[PDB]
């Protein structure tokens, strides 16, 4: 019953590996659906082709910005942004897919994949999913994101979609 989407990661055009995620619809539907709906690109916009503009080693990997690709843009399927459905799920560790907001009730299309346990984000960011397969792919994306976050090389979402 829980949706499974994926990202085919490419480092500078050359494919690296696939990374699938489990969307916890059974807890946070609207957030869950928006990422599934945007991972498939059914409205005409989404993750295919967008990159991870912000990767901070030992912390997380941020992407989802298909409009301004510099951490400014991106939008939800509901128009601009949306509310904070809930805060039931916590950032328990690496693999956690959560929404990258700009303060409360500002969820759009940006998200981040955790590459370590980030409990200080608990209550401030809506956790809505988790990496099912390919967590070694995000582990590699690592060396390509600096301390400040600027990538050394372009990490891009070559292909993405829904598998179940």
């Amino acid at each position: 019953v829980n949706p499974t989407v994926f990202f085919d990661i490419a480092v500078d055009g050359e494919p690296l590996g696939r990374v699938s995620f489990e969307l916890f619809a059974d807890k946070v539907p609207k957030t869950a659906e928006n990422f599934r709906a945007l991972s498939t690109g059914e409205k005409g916009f989404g993750y295919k082709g967008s990159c991870f503009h912000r990767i901070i080693p030992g912390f997380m990997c941020q992407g989802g910005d298909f409009t301004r690709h510099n951490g400014t843009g991106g939008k939800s399927i509901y128009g601009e942004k949306f509310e904070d459905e809930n805060f039931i799920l916590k950032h328990t560790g690496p693999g956690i897919l959560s929404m990258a907001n700009a303060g409360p009730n500002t969820n759009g299309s940006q998200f981040f994949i955790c590459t370590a346990k980030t409990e200080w984000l608990d209550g401030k960011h809506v956790v809505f999913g988790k990496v099912k397969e390919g967590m070694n792919i995000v582990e590699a994306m690592e060396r390509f994101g600096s301390r400040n976050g600027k990538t050394s090389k372009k990490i891009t979402i070559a292909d993405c979609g829904q598998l179940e």
């Binding site: 940006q110 984000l121 401030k124």
Partner: peptide, 6 residues
């Protein structure tokens, strides 16, 4: 402006 801090 979207994003979480370390």
């Amino acid at each position: 402006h979207a994003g979480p801090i370390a």
